[PDB]
Write a protein that binds this ligand. Structure first.
Ligand SMILES: [Ca+2]
Ligand SMILES: [Ca+2]
Ligand SMILES: [Ca+2]
Ligand SMILES: [Ca+2]
Ligand SMILES: [Cl-]
Ligand SMILES: [Cl-]
Ligand SMILES: [Zn+2]
Ligand SMILES: [Zn+2]
Lengths: 150, 150
């Protein structure tokens, strides 16, 4: 599309993000649903799209990863940097006040966000992670909990 | 995805839309850009996705089409119902305060919105329209102007 050049600049410009229109999450999620209906005739997943999305956000450090989530309005990420610098995986990342708080489901629903975390983390630390959501607000928990490996 | 059932209910529930998190448009547009990078190995367009998106919004009348655009935060649509009931196409629809007001481009940029209008209009009047954006805020105009045919 013709608008795509302008989008990569926009995500680097915090003033554009702050001054831009804000769209309710449901419509955001409708977009994905509609495409996946015209992706199927071919196959990717939402985790994988999140991985590419987080690559593209390319945060500089964990603090910028936290700020980008607040900008996006995806909630408050808890990440222990001190543990990340020093200790070995698994790491654990919590997400408070995430999108789709109104959804009730047996299994965790934030696959897209898990991928985002995976791709942002490789952009910061320059090696590949896999991120798996093991608890979710969807199950009546207070926070989403994501285990981070490799 | 597992979240997709909940999305169709959400877009029918105005309280969910009102209470949900609001995401800056740039991130919304990044999502599309990232998918289209994993759609290409196959081919649709953004107009066509908008057509399907507007089908899915399925507004009841033109007034609900205006309210849905305000809910979504895609701006103030001007549509003359009196002309639409009586007279023959072309119709003209204006959009004030649309998304991507910060983008500057020679050709109009709201292809996705043009499709949305096309699909919402067939959901209201039960026959097919084609909608073409002929002026855009991207060109320094005050409003986006869309011509509606068939
Ligand atoms: Ca990299
Ligand atoms: Ca890089
Ligand atoms: Ca129909
Ligand atoms: Ca219908
Ligand atoms: Cl939400
Ligand atoms: Cl915007
Ligand atoms: Zn979750
Ligand atoms: Zn326009």
């Amino acid at each position: 599309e013709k608008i795509f050049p302008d989008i990569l600049e926009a995500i680097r410009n915090e003033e554009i993000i702050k001054e831009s229109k804000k769209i309710p999450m449901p419509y955001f999620g409708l977009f994905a649903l509609v495409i996946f209906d015209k992706v199927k005739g071919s196959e990717t997943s939402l985790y994988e799209i999140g991985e590419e999305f987080g690559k593209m956000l390319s945060p500089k450090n964990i603090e910028e990863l936290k700020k980008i989530f607040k900008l996006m309005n995806f909630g408050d990420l808890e990440i222990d940097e001190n543990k990340i610098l020093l200790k070995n995986p698994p790491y654990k990342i919590k997400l408070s006040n995430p999108p789709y708080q109104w959804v009730s489901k047996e299994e965790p629903i934030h696959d897209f966000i898990a991928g985002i975390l995976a791709g942002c983390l490789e952009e910061i630390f320059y090696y590949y992670f896999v991120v798996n959501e093991v608890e979710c607000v969807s199950q009546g928990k207070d926070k989403c909990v994501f285990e981070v490996k490799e």
